[PDB]
């Protein structure tokens, strides 16, 4: 029903499959929060102790991963306090290389 064009960079797209930009689709309820989107990526999209383990750590994202929502900072709004919106442009980045 919905669609979100996310752009993974730094060291995230490498896990997805060298995909600088990937679209996601979720179908559950109307008031779908951003936290749900990430969940979808870690549920059906990804399912292995290597790709998701590094991204999510015990229901908690790994401190350091960047996430630009609508050309803005994730923490700026409220992390998971941002309702989704089909037709948005999300961006992900990682300031970590080697070690």
Swiss-Prot record:
It comes from the Eukaryota. CDD domains: Ubl_Urm1. Pathway: tRNA modification; 5-methoxycarbonylmethyl-2-thiouridine-tRNA biosynthesis. The keyword Cytoplasm applies. Acts as a sulfur carrier required for 2-thiolation of mcm(5)S(2)U at tRNA wobble positions of cytosolic tRNA(Lys), tRNA(Glu) and tRNA(Gln). Serves as sulfur donor in tRNA 2-thiolation reaction by being thiocarboxylated (-COSH) at its C-terminus by the MOCS3 homolog UBA4. The sulfur is then transferred to tRNA to form 2-thiolation of mcm(5)S(2)U. Prior mcm(5) tRNA modification by the elongator complex is required for 2-thiolation. Also acts as a ubiquitin-like protein (UBL) that is covalently conjugated via an isopeptide bond to lysine residues of target proteins such as AHP1. This is Ubiquitin-related modifier 1. Belongs to the URM1 family. The modification 1-thioglycine is found at residue 99. The keyword DNA-binding does not apply. GO terms for molecular function: protein homodimerization activity; protein tag activity; sulfur carrier activity. GO terms for cellular component: cytoplasm; cytosol; nucleus. The gene is URM1. C-terminal thiocarboxylation occurs in 2 steps, it is first acyl-adenylated (-COAMP) via the hesA/moeB/thiF part of UBA4, then thiocarboxylated (-COSH) via the rhodanese domain of UBA4. Gene3D superfamilies: 3.10.20.30. One of its GO terms (biological process) is tRNA thio-modification.
């Amino acid at each position: 029903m919905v669609n979100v064009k996310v752009e993974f960079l730094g060291g995230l797209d490498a896990i997805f499959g060298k995909q600088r930009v990937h679209k996601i689709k979720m179908d559950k309820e109307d008031p779908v929060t951003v936290g749900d989107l990430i969940d979808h990526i870690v549920s059906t999209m990804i399912n292995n102790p290597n790709d998701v383990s590094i991204f999510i750590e015990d229901d908690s994202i790994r401190p350091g991963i960047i996430t630009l929502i609508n050309d803005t900072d994730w923490e700026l709004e409220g992390e998971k306090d941002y309702i989704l919106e089909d037709g948005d442009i999300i961006s992900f980045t990682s300031t970590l290389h080697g070690g």
